[PDB]
């Protein structure tokens, strides 16, 4: 391949050739199979509003045109409804044929934290232009849970690519023949469509979770230390297979489809556009090569954050909620310790 | 006695005498031992805001300064909206007789904000001695949308001659002979305090109103599935509860309470702590409340926090139950 996504080996090579820089050595687990986690620096800037830097504008200038400074050396609480800009430890000097995009880590979405990566001269968020040299910034606004963050916190990730080696319908339908993309012959390719499972799981019929209010603060570095029942309310199928989505709430829900991303492909979750005005999958993110790897079954369900917009919506089982889009890897991932993806 | 609260027998005599008037004959169960239910008439007025009529002012003068809704079949009243509803009943009280209004406990359970207003009122839920005129209910649903109609009963009125209250001797004396608490009582009437330990295997302490729901029909409100309107609350860890100010709670007192047949009682908010949380929809207790069947019955309480979240703890005093003399025993 001469077009596709950079695997971890390449991301590591980029760091070794100073095309990607950081304030410190990377975390051992910082480079994912087809993306890199980004870490917060030592200062957060509390802002009145989010902004677009614009053409020929450094992010630092707009900042200086506005503003409370928060030190993250130990840990700061970011409150819901509040907007913070954070210089990231990682910076770039990209090859002119290489671009990148950013998405929240999936655990970021489970805590309902709004984030945007910004570049100098930015006209769009979460997009790094081909050949970009400069710093990176994370805009952070917690929506449901107040959070604690510090120097090193990882809320976001960046995927690097040469060109845009997306698969079209035919390529996707053939990969499902060769490998298994959905554990079901055969999927609705359009990429592959994801629908909502509202029938229930287990003996009690658990469908998912709704976020709670006035919780304790969530430490984003120690997320497994927090009891489930004092942040999330479990939701159980009781009547018909359907759920009223209250627009002020956030819901952690699950796809009906068990999905697989083969090791020479990465994926990205996208909103189902025909219905963006009704409800949306929030915090759509990157899927790594090897997701839902064949085990004795193939494929994992996707966990989805769904919110309704403006008006309450009765979401029904089997409703299509997103589209998993596939893209070629440049090479096969080498894995966490460089000794294989498994 | 020559001072105290009118019993049912006296309330019927007011109606006989045209001191209490209505558009229609009263419902068979409209008169209570120590109060009268008030009924909605045929029209509601959708208003921009609540208002006090004030000196020399008729409510209908302020009303016509709206949008008119017909209650003949049923209307839905939305949460956050204010409606003013002319009541079916009106008064021509004697000079020595006053009245006061509280919501019905059922109204309270549904988080329906209500205020009785009169012509020339400088205060809600207070009918001046010798009041002659109409009555109006201000209504605003806070948690559940509701359906109401002509004849719906959301509020009640207690009539009194004078103001025959009790004191710390009388109250402890009365608790001596007749039992005021199945326990001993904190008299300043008796402090009521909150039960947050739980009930049963599961430890159910109460309910929280659910924040998007079907419309509740106030006349037929023992018709629904409980999980459709309420979130059960179960105690876990400490015997305590965080009161989110956006939230409505139905909880229960620790004390089993009893009102002897020659007394009426009224729940009042606990004033020391009212800048922090309040018992909402404090209402009337009829003579005979909690009559031996195990003597005494528990008070169900609606509680909300003011402005800031508050940790409510087991055995917190949440109110005071205030006793008063009947003029005569309920007929």
């Amino acid at each position: 391949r001469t077009t596709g996504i950079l695997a971890d080996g390449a991301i590591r090579a980029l760091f070794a050739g100073d095309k990607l820089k950081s304030e410190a050595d990377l975390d051992v687990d910082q480079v994912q199979p087809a993306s890199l986690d980004l870490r917060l620096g030592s200062k957060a800037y509390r802002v009145r509003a989010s902004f677009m830097p614009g053409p020929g504008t450094r992010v630092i200038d707009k900042l200086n045109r506005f503003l409370h400074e928060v030190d993250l050396s130990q840990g700061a609480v970011l409150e819901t409804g509040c907007v913070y800009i954070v210089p990231l430890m990682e910076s770039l000097a990209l090859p002119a044929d290489m671009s990148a995009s950013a998405n929240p880590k999936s655990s970021t979405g489970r805590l309902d934290i709004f984030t945007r990566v910004m570049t100098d001269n930015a006209q769009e968020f979460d997009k790094i232009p081909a050949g970009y040299t400069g710093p990176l910034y994370l805009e952070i606004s917690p929506r449901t849970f107040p959070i604690v963050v510090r120097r090193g916190s990882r809320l976001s990730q960046i995927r690097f690519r040469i060109g845009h080696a997306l698969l079209n319908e035919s390529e996707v339908l053939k990969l499902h023949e060769t490998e298994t993309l959905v554990a079901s012959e055969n999927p609705n390719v359009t990429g592959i469509a994801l629908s909502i499972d509202l029938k229930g799981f287990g003996e009690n019929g658990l469908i998912g979770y709704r976020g709670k209010h006035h919780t304790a603060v969530v430490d984003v570095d120690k997320k497994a230390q927090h009891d489930v029942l004092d942040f999330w309310e479990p939701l159980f199928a009781r009547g018909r297979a359907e759920l009223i989505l209250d627009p002020d709430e956030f819901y952690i829900l699950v796809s009906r489809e068990a999905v697989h991303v083969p090791p020479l492909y990465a994926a990205e979750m996208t909103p189902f556009d025909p219905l963006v005005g009704e409800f949306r999958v929030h915090y759509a993110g990157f899927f790594d090569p090897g997701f839902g790897h064949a085990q004795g079954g193939t494929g994992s369900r996707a966990v989805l954050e769904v919110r309704s917009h403006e008006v309450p919506f009765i979401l029904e089982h089997g409703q299509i909620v997103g589209r998993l889009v596939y893209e070629h890897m440049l090479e096969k991932p080498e894995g966490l310790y460089g000794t294989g993806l498994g | 006695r020559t001072t105290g609260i009118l019993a049912d027998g006296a309330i019927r005599a007011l109606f006989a005498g045209d001191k209490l008037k209505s558009e229609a004959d009263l419902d068979v169960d409209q008169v209570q031992p120590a109060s009268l239910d008030l009924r909605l008439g045929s029209k509601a007025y959708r208003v921009r805001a609540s208002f006090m009529p004030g000196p020399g002012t008729r409510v209908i003068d302020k009303l016509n300064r709206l949008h008119e809704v017909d209650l003949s079949q049923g209307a839905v009243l939305e949460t956050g909206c204010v409606y003013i509803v002319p009541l079916m009943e009106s008064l021509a009280l004697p000079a020595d007789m006053s009245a006061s209004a509280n919501p019905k406990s059922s109204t309270g359970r549904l988080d329906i904000f209500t205020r009785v207003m009169t012509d020339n009122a400088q205060e809600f839920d207070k009918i001046p001695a010798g009041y002659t005129g109409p009555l109006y209910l201000e209504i605003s649903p806070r948690t559940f949308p509701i359906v109401v109609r002509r004849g719906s009963r959301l509020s009640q009125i207690r009539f009194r001659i004078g103001h025959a209250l009790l004191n710390e001797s009388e109250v402890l004396k009365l608790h001596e002979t007749e039992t005021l608490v199945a326990s001993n009582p904190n008299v300043t009437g008796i402090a009521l305090s909150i039960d947050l330990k739980g009930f049963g295997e599961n430890g159910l302490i109460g309910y929280r109103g659910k924040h998007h729901t079907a419309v509740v029909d106030v006349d037929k409100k023992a018709q629904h599935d409980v999980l459709d309107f309420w979130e059960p609350l179960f105690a876990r860890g400490r015997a305590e509860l965080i009161l989110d100010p956006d939230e409505f709670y139905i909880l229960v007192s620790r004390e089993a309470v009893h009102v002897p047949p020659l007394y009426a009682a009224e729940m009042t908010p606990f004033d020391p702590l009212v800048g922090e949380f309040r018992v909402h929809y404090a209402g009337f207790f009829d003579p005979g409340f909690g009559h031996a069947q195990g003597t005494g019955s528990r008070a169900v309480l609606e509680v909300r926090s003011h402005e800031v979240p508050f940790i409510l703890e087991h055995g917190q005093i949440v109110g005071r139950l205030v006793y008063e003399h009947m003029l005569e025993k309920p007929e």
């Binding site: 029942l229 004092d230 | 947050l196 739980g198 430890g203 979130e231 179960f234 876990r236 965080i242």
Partner: peptide, 7 residues
Amino acid sequence: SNPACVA
């Protein structure tokens, strides 16, 4: 063994 909702 005690259900949700939890207070």
